[PDB]
Structures are given as C-alpha cells and as structure tokens.
Amino acid sequence: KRAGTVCSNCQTSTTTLWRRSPMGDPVCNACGLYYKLHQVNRPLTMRKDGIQTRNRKVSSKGKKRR
DNA sequence: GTTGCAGATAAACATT
DNA sequence: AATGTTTATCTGCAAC
Ligand SMILES: [Zn+2]
Numbered sequence: 124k125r126a127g128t129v130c131s132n133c134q135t136s137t138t139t140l141w142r143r144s145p146m147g148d149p150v151c152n153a154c155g156l157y158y159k160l161h162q163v164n165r166p167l168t169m170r171k172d173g174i175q176t177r178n179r180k181v182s183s184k185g186k187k188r189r
Numbered sequence: 190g191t192t193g194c195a196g197a198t199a200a201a202c203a204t205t
Numbered sequence: 206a207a208t209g210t211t212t213a214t215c216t217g218c219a220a221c
Contacts, residue, residue: 139213140195153212160210169211177213180200185216 130154133167137174 129136131148142155150158157165 142195157211175213177201179214180198183199183215 132158132164133170135170137172139174 125136125141128141128149130138130151131144132150132154135151135153138151138153140152142150142152144150144155144158153169
C-alpha cells in the first residue's frame, strides 16, 4: 500500500523501506530508526526529494556457512 | 517457484 | 583524527 502512504513524521513519499510506528502511523525508513533511537520529532532539513544512495558496502552477506 | 514486506548490519558523514 | 550518529542496501520468511 504505497498509494498515498506519506511519512507521518516527515511526509516524504520516497522511502527505501516503509516502517510502522508504535502508534500505527506510517513512517519512512529514516524516521523509524531516528525516532526509535531518540523518540523525538526533528525538522525536515535532513530531507531531499529523491532517495539518497551510496556505494554498496563490501558485499558482506549472510554469504555462507550453515 | 515467485513475489512482497519487515527487520538488522555495517559503512560513511558530520561533529568536535 | 576518533567517536557518535545516521541512513541505504542486503537478506530472509510466509503465503499462494
Ligand atoms: Zn520520515
């Protein structure tokens, strides 16, 4: 259900992963983690239109073993 | 057999 | 410079 889903905390409609807040308020992957760590609302000065991207860290993965 | 969704890690950025 | 802090991307599981 991304149709109309807007981050309740920061209104962004672009998110890498949609989270759900303890209140049931849709939030973007960033607000969910920041909010969970600090549990406070922050100004939208950290937001950008599209999503930010970065070089994929080392291909570290659950690779193997058992 | 494929898709979708949720959650967690590690890296890099900013600050001091 | 190191640490603290932050966010993007990866994978897995369940159901059909
Ligand atoms: Zn948000």
